[PDB]
Amino acid sequence: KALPRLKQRYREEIREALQQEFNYANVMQIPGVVKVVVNMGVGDAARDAKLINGAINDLALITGQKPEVRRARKSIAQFKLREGMPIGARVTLRGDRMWEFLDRLISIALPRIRDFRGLSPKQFDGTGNYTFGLNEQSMFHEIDVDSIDRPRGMDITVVTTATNDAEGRALLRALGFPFKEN
RNA sequence: GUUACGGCGGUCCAUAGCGGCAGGGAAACGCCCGGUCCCAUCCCGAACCCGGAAGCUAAGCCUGCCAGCGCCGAUGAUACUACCCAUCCGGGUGGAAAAGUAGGACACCGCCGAACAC
Ligand SMILES: [Mg+2]
Ligand SMILES: [Mg+2]
Ligand SMILES: [Mg+2]
Ligand SMILES: [Mg+2]
Ligand SMILES: [Mg+2]
Ligand SMILES: [Mg+2]
Ligand SMILES: [Mg+2]
Ligand SMILES: [Mg+2]
Ligand SMILES: [Mg+2]
Ligand SMILES: [Mg+2]
Ligand SMILES: [Mg+2]
């Protein structure tokens, strides 16, 4: 008896706009958002693993669901890194959690970005895939500024079912993230 | 019996694989919707699983065509070798490669089950 507003927008106007504007053979060739992954790797756990717990707490307040601790598959003596330490965090947003998190991002963080000039179009890899990395991590309203001790990382990732770059452009612009103009 | 239909299997498992080009939703096969209850995430209904058919053959799958790449492969020749003669030098009988070549080539078959007909 509940349905997110962005999902509603997608199922009412976005899909029909895409369908009419590229003239697909069928209807479900509409691209769709697939998965939302949120994570970051501190890298200094090789010296101190205490801040991993702080990163876990930060992720917990950001997504609301418990993160992960994963190791390194290779050993780098130059980085004083061997297999077995936990290196970063991991969590994934899926379904209603995708839609709520995308809402929260687009409506709270992007307007607030310090010195926001938009995002370029040229960071796709030819099939509409996009993961990337941000100036400051305390940006969401769900986290408080008084309790932070050091700048760490955090994640906002959107991906598509898109076959190539054309519908990637189309659907990302229909959804409306601050794309630059060149 | 027919079908552009799904399962279980075969063969000294690529003549059967990869890629490109077209077509399919009657039932089925898929994608799909949402997590009250079984069940689970080293997080997440992603996977498994729970409940249904609003929607769709585009992927998957199948069928058909392409020699683009892979694959199989002669007859004949060459290398090798078992045995024996010939004062070193060499020859006679038997077996016959590998590579390459003309070409072949976009699998075949068995048992049940789905729609139509008898
Ligand atoms: Mg893609
Ligand atoms: Mg039907
Ligand atoms: Mg689901
Ligand atoms: Mg198709
Ligand atoms: Mg397909
Ligand atoms: Mg070969
Ligand atoms: Mg072949
Ligand atoms: Mg011969
Ligand atoms: Mg003798
Ligand atoms: Mg002699
Ligand atoms: Mg031969």
Swiss-Prot record:
Keyword Ribosomal protein: yes
High-level lineage: Bacteria, Bacillati, Actinomycetota, Actinomycetes, Mycobacteriales
Name the UniProt record assigns to this protein: Large ribosomal subunit protein uL5
Record's function text: This is one of the proteins that bind and probably mediate the attachment of the 5S RNA into the large ribosomal subunit, where it forms part of the central protuberance. In the 70S ribosome it contacts protein S13 of the 30S subunit (bridge B1b), connecting the 2 subunits; this bridge is implicated in subunit movement. Contacts the P site tRNA; the 5S rRNA and some of its associated proteins might help stabilize positioning of ribosome-bound tRNAs.
Gene Ontology molecular function, alphabetical: rRNA binding; structural constituent of ribosome; tRNA binding
Subunit structure: Part of the 50S ribosomal subunit; part of the 5S rRNA/L5/L18/L25 subcomplex. Contacts the 5S rRNA and the P site tRNA. Forms a bridge to the 30S subunit in the 70S ribosome.
SUPFAM superfamilies: RL5-like
PANTHER family: 60S RIBOSOMAL PROTEIN L11-RELATED
Highest taxon above the source species: Bacteria
Organism: Mycolicibacterium smegmatis (strain ATCC 700084 / mc(2)155)
Protein family (similarity comment): Belongs to the universal ribosomal protein uL5 family.
GO cellular component terms given for this protein: ribonucleoprotein complex; ribosome
Gene Ontology annotations of biological process type: translation
Keyword annotations of the record: Ribonucleoprotein, Ribosomal protein, RNA-binding, rRNA-binding, tRNA-binding
